[PDB]
Amino acid sequence: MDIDPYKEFGATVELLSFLPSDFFPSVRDLLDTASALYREALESPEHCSPHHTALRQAILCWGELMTLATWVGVNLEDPASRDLVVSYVNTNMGLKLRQLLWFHISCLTFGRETVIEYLVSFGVWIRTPPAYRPPNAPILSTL
Amino acid sequence: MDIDPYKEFGATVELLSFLPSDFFPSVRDLLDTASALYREALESPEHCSPHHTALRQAILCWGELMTLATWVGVNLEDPASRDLVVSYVNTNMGLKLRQLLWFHISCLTFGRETVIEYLVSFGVWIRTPPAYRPPNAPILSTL
Amino acid sequence: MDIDPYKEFGATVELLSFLPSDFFPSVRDLLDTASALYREALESPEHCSPHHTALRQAILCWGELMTLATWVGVNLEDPASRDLVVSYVNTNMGLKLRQLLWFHISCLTFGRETVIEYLVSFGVWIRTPPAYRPPNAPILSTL
Amino acid sequence: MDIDPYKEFGATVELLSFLPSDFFPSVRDLLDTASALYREALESPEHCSPHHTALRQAILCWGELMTLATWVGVNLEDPASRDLVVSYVNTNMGLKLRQLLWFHISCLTFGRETVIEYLVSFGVWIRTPPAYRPPNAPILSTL
């Protein structure tokens, strides 16, 4: 199957490619934001929203990757392989996980429609070449 | 955090640990089933159900894990360590995957409540001594 | 004081005495069933039913007998006596714990009156010599 | 499972640990009290109260510990190991059984609320430094 995780929620993998990969915060920072703002809802037995369901799945996927990294560090004996796998699991997969975390956290905090319009506007800003690019980049905010 | 992926659906990691690990179908079989029965809906841009959202997320997590397996095959030179990582992925993460997929596919097929009652019943059955239980292992059916 | 643990619940040690030893599930299986089916309630601050109260007391009693078994294994350097005590605890006391656990779990699952009628019928069946009874014992089950 | 025997009764293991171990009466004295006051209701086929249910279970747990002690005395011929097991069963497990018996007998006699208030008061008295601790330790009374 060809499943786009954002196709529900009115976005696409291509739209989020407007944002550069180095734009997204670290998984630690994003999980801290999730705990700060939505811990009780995430731990709840309610389907509070599709975003909440998806964020739950993403947090668990990251947790299982961390369990794998620990298991590698304990059960592998070749340090080169140990560290290659650990770094891969921390960086390459972390990128997509923090895309997902960012999208859903931002849509809960600010609104799905607002986030999609931020994506469009930031794509404008970032495609605008530097000579003509304003310094005030689009930024998600309430106030 | 402490997120149980089944409690928003009325179940628990414990309750799915109540069935034996070997009862759960293979990942290949479950993904074939997911495709055959719900590919169009999973690929669609609609929040068809929380089961569908969870299932999309899990299918993509497993896809990234398979991608990890391939990346290891290529960029690892220790065959013992490569085999060890691939086997951890196929077995330990695969079991959690097939529990999750079995649960959500079976919910969509038969009913979430039917599935939870089936878990309880089948666990009690597999624990009852044979001379004092119905002889055939319970099964879900739509016929 | 001469207390019967089932008289409270409409049954009697004499009624459950007709159930053979091979009829009851293991202590581990019964405890896993208790957890899976009624953990939220057993761990709760509510009197949910006399069966729940009794089940809590029985589970904690077994926990203390297991503490005893561990203590024996760690403190007695005479292997014969060590194993003799462990076997007594796991067989003679395990059997009573299994009787009680089965009774209360089955009551919660099926109905106290249903369990009592099942015991009456099972006693009839087991008192009947094999030549003159159906070969399959009566079944208490969800299916 | 992690079951607190007093949660359903408004207390905790933390609150009963306000009392020292050497504060609780002997199992003999507690059983004599239970007989002399509530034998009729404990021997009865009625759920008189959750406390009565729990007391019945405790009484039978102690009966089984006594049976184990007798069986050890008969079936172990290494006096050392016999004595170790008998002492453990009479002392270490006796402690928890007399906590339980004291709690439920005192509840039946005085009120569960009165017993919980007695626990917080004894906490005050025992945490108070000696130079200001009144000789009259708190005590339960009906007058």
Residue numbers in the entry:
A (entry chain D), B (entry chain C), C (entry chain B), D (entry chain A): 1 to 143
Show sentences the authors wrote:
Instead, most of the mutations with a secretion phenotype map to a hydrophobic pocket in the center of the spikes below the SS-bridge in the rigid part of the assembly domain.
Intrigued by the changes in the rotamer conformation of Phe-97, we revisited the mutant HBc-F97L, which is a naturally occurring variant with an immature secretion phenotype.
